[PDB]
Design a binder for this molecule. Sequence first.
Ligand SMILES: CC(=O)N[C@H]1[C@H](O[C@H]2[C@H](O)[C@@H](NC(C)=O)C(=O)O[C@@H]2CO)O[C@H](CO)[C@@H](O)[C@@H]1O
Ligand SMILES: CC(=O)N[C@H]1[C@H](O[C@H]2[C@H](O)[C@@H](NC(C)=O)C(=O)O[C@@H]2CO)O[C@H](CO)[C@@H](O)[C@@H]1O
Lengths: 496, 497
Amino acid sequence: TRKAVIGYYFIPTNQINNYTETDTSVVPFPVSNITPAKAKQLTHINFSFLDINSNLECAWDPATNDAKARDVVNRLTALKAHNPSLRIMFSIGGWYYSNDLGVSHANYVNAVKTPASRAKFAQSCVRIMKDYGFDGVDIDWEYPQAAEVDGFIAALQEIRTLLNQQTITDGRQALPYQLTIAGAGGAFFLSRYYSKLAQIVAPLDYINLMTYDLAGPWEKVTNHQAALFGDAAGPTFYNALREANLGWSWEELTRAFPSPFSLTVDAAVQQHLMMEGVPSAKIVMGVPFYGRAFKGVSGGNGGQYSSHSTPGEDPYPSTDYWLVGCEECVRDKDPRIASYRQLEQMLQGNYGYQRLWNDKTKTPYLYHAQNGLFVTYDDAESFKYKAKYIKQQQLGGVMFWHLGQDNRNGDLLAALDRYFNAADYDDSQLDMGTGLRYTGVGPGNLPIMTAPAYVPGTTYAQGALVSYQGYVWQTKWGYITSAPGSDSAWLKVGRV
Amino acid sequence: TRKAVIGYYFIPTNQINNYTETDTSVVPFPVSNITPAKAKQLTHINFSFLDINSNLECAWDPATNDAKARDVVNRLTALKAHNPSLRIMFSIGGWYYSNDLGVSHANYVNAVKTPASRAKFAQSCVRIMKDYGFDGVDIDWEYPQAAEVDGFIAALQEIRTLLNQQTITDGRQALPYQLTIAGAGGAFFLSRYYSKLAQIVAPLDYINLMTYDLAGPWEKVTNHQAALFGDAAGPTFYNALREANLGWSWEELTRAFPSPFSLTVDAAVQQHLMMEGVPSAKIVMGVPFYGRAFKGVSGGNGGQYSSHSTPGEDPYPSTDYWLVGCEECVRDKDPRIASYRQLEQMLQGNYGYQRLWNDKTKTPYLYHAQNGLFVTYDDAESFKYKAKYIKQQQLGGVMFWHLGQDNRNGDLLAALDRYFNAADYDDSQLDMGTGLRYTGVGPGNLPIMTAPAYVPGTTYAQGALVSYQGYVWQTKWGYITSAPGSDSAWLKVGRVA
Ligand SMILES: CC(=O)N[C@H]1[C@H](O[C@H]2[C@H](O)[C@@H](NC(C)=O)C(=O)O[C@@H]2CO)O[C@H](CO)[C@@H](O)[C@@H]1O
Ligand SMILES: CC(=O)N[C@H]1[C@H](O[C@H]2[C@H](O)[C@@H](NC(C)=O)C(=O)O[C@@H]2CO)O[C@H](CO)[C@@H](O)[C@@H]1O
């Protein structure tokens, strides 16, 4: 089955209100950049972002010119003429509106609080969808805290119910309306709802992992923001999932959540697969179409794993635009981020950037020896390893943030489509390397194993293996006289 | 309040049926050995053991001659004329009858299953108690598994209700009928019901901890079976409590249950004290009146912490009675265990054993350099430290297995009574040593802590401390913007005054 290629596409309200397809000075990446050929390379475009207003319903930012907005959305849905599998989804949330300290946080917390609020919200989601011509709903709340989870889940279940009814009502069996969420791609935020992953994922077509922003100026050591695998020389982190309210034993938690560990794209994926009821087909790996830059880094490793002097707060707490060659950073007043389009332009100019490659994390990085700068980003090469990983792990596809940051030629999007679908691309010999793999084991990814059936009345020594209730178990200490599941001396270690 | 001194008194069915007080080869330790002076040294005698039958009722083993049984029990209750505080309890269970593979295990499991089974079983306990003249009931089931614990708790609560009614009916308010249980003294078995300890202990007057058998030939390294404190040179074990169904986070389990740890008497007592709702006054520390022997031991360290060649299975598989001087072992056909009485005689018979002392564990041991023998046991000196620990930790008292293993003079019982009640015994200067203390901290025994109240809308750095809803909490990582209590970012580390 074809892999999903989901491109979030972010158009700030100012660009909607002053939309133009002929002045990259006002709208740097307008819809017209998405040619028929590019429309065919995508399976989904997630228009970003809608929000949740104080009436606790899905709605466009209050400052939005509703007519320009409907027009921008129409240009997107018009792309469907070139790709019958294409869906224009809309995404609600995003960091700005929904983070704990964000402008609309309260609205998310309250919208899912009651059966009544949940019903009114779910209904506004479907109404907005049908009114603007969207093909599905993506929820990007970063992130419901542990207490708000059961409500978040109920809300997704209600939306699912309404969308399924609408699909039938609209004769959309061929292209059913969909419901997805953008999920954490790092253990710290994932720990908030991890214990209920199966319930969160059940009503979704996909869970889009934000497997990026895994490094940034808010961290003391420079690092790759989307390493596929770990580099023993890089920083390691506390495994937050061992603290999730999972109700597992010390032994179970320790083998599922090694700590510290390498914060990588593979870690996030494996962490989701470890849970029962989280099918690999619904997991979508996110990739960044932008890089993060750090200043004041020292040398010796190309800028990797170095202390730095980059402000970590938002907004950028200064007027010093130190990312040499980044004119976009001047336009957006933040030298800590740059689109792949801009990065390429910086490389093409002589600004002193050396493009380096880490063969463990399988990602590129830039090093500016003169001014001590380090930029972590992704490109068509790192996408080869991620695309192969998606195939090997049988994931649903790839997602990216965000379309408008690709170069004019659409090279990043083209690469992604090529790796999954081109008849003349062959990655059979691509070597995944020796970077660190996340090795945790959980209920959802137990190894197939065989062992003698447990025999009631038998005494087992430490380390013995038996099969019982369709699982393979191992005793944690000796002289075990009770059965697996009824005696905590037994550890589930395999399946079948 | 007087410290309890609870002596289990084990007399096998065969000894009951052939009971005599003039033939030590038939009944080694008759009730006649307990004089009025000795009776005053006890607060409880736990006659061992009655069982639960297939009818799911408390009963004597069917092979028991009933007249002979009443006669032995009368000799025990007659001891009450010499001590107005003394209670002759009866204990249901024991290892033989109640272990998972024991002969009557299914009866324990089934008896506690339903309101109806529990009522019937509980009424039979009171019936047996009144019929034979006992003063209370002790349950020694080794041990209920997780799924059976709720039934076990309800059964105990039912017995409690019936005993209290019986106390009123009998006008026994001066010496109320009591209910106790013998509980595990080591983490492996304790993990079966640990999570519900408070509910199990609530209906009880005391929980008698079996803080012995912590070492034995079934273990690859020789060790003290009842070390009070740990010895860094001795073996350590995985702390099974980390696998109990507690619902605690990895950090809480890790902090509460250090691992590996030293399996000691102090560790069991502290593990019980850690749980909220378990009063120290109900905890009774057990001590053994017997030792366990190992052979094939190496020298260099008195035979301590060495590999050995001792059969670990029961029954003893051969006829090689290699514990030199232990004639009791020949009679009972097992050289792996000997009563204190016998161990004292072995030392007396000049058979080549050296009495050594571990000043970390505060326990004695025998080492036979010639034959390569190691014996772990307790004596009047190790009891001095245990008695001071009981006073220090404010425990309910001491329990011992078992009375019939003391020497003829009753020196071990007398030592215990002395340490708690003798006006001329003063342990105020007794040095408890530098042995390893167990210091786990669980959300059940948090220290009083002080920290600024939690400020919503604040972003906390890793390690920050705040007070919130009755507790002090610490962040386990950075940029915490969530409130304490709910999510996994905060660790409960203290209680707010
Ligand atoms: C670097 C960048 O473009 N930052 C913009 C930020 O993007 C966030 C997304 O909001 C969030 N959601 C998804 C699906 O990616 C995410 O996980 O990471 C990206 C990149 O950090 O979004 C805000 C608005 O919410 C923009 O103002 C930022 O410029
Ligand atoms: C060494 C000894 O005396 N062994 C006898 C054994 O004693 C067990 C108790 O059954 C059990 N209960 C209590 C309150 O102590 C225990 O925890 O350990 C002691 C000592 O190991 O009891 C059985 C009968 O159940 C006898 O056959 C053993 O000889």
